[PDB]
């Protein structure tokens, strides 16, 4: 699909303050609640915080580098909902699907022209 040049604004992950120093403090983002915190008062040098400005362009949101929107698929029935949106959406074969069923899904998605984001998953030659 002819897509716009996808701008990301912030590629780096918004890690927590002192997530790296201490081990018990997780890298998952939590706001600094204390009034005397430098991160909360956004001092120069300190880590950047997640705010609404970093939000992605509506036209190019949810899009993978291929220019397709991601879409989970369990079986051949859920796969065949994207018979009309091959250029827009891409089949993401779910993690828990067996190797026995994937060979079936990949056969159909290849025929319908649906780009699968994760082929070669559990499947040798």
């Amino acid at each position: 699909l002819p897509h716009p040049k996808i701008v990301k604004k912030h590629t780096k992950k918004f890690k927590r303050h002192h997530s790296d120093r201490y081990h018990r403090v997780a890298e998952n983002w939590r706001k600094q609640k204390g009034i005397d915190s430098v991160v909360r008062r956004r001092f120069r040098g300190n880590i950047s915080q997640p705010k609404i400005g970093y939000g992605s362009n509506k036209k190019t949101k949810f899009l993978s580098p291929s220019g397709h929107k991601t879409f989970l698929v369990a079986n051949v029935k859920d796969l065949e909902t994207l018979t009309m949106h091959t250029k827009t959406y891409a089949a993401e074969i779910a993690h828990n699907i067996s190797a026995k069923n994937r060979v079936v899904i990949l056969a159909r998605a290849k025929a319908l022209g649906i780009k699968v984001t994760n082929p070669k998953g559990r499947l040798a030659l």
Partner: protein
């Protein structure tokens, strides 16, 4: 009626929706034109509804009349659509006379894609592929790991060559 059917499935459950991470909604009711679901693009909310499907290679165009709201057994009236593309789009047009321009070009569009799904035959005539997907079951992944590591230990390759060089070049002296 049908507005009351829509609002009750728009929220309050259309029990065949797929919420994609894109926030998009997909009706998997086999009879819808757009795989996506929206008002009068899904076959339950709307009362007049056309669709192209395939049961075999024969591509039929199903049609739903509000006359048959009483009887769900014979809801979808269906017509075969020749096989040549040009006469089929013309075949489509006559059925869609005096309808929404939605079903007019969208059944035209269903027919287009489902005919270029018959690129399956192209893949299956020029198949002859020496690959075929093989599963890697994690039991086999260790029957063929931990037994090779047990092979090498009992193998003693060095001692085997050391024997069958001396045993060779004594007899080939």
């Amino acid at each position: 009626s049908d507005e009351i059917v829509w609002q009750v499935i728009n929220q309050s459950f259309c029990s065949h929706r797929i919420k994609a991470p894109n926030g998009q909604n997909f009706c998997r009711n086999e009879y819808n034109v757009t795989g996506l679901c929206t008002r009068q693009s899904c076959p339950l909310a709307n009362s007049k509804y056309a669709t192209v499907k395939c049961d075999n290679g024969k591509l039929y165009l199903y049609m739903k009349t509000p006359e048959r709201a009483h009887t769900p057994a014979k809801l979808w009236e269906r017509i075969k659509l020749s096989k040549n593309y040009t006469k089929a789009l013309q075949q489509i047009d006559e059925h869609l006379l005096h309808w929404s321009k939605f079903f007019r070009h969208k059944c035209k569009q269903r027919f287009t894609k489902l005919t270029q799904v018959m690129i399956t035959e192209r893949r299956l005539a020029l198949r002859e592929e020496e690959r075929h997907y093989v599963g890697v079951a994690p039991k086999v992944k260790r029957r063929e790991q931990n037994r090779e590591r047990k092979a090498l230990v009992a193998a003693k390759i060095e001692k085997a060559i050391e024997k069958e060089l001396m045993d060779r070049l004594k007899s080939g002296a």
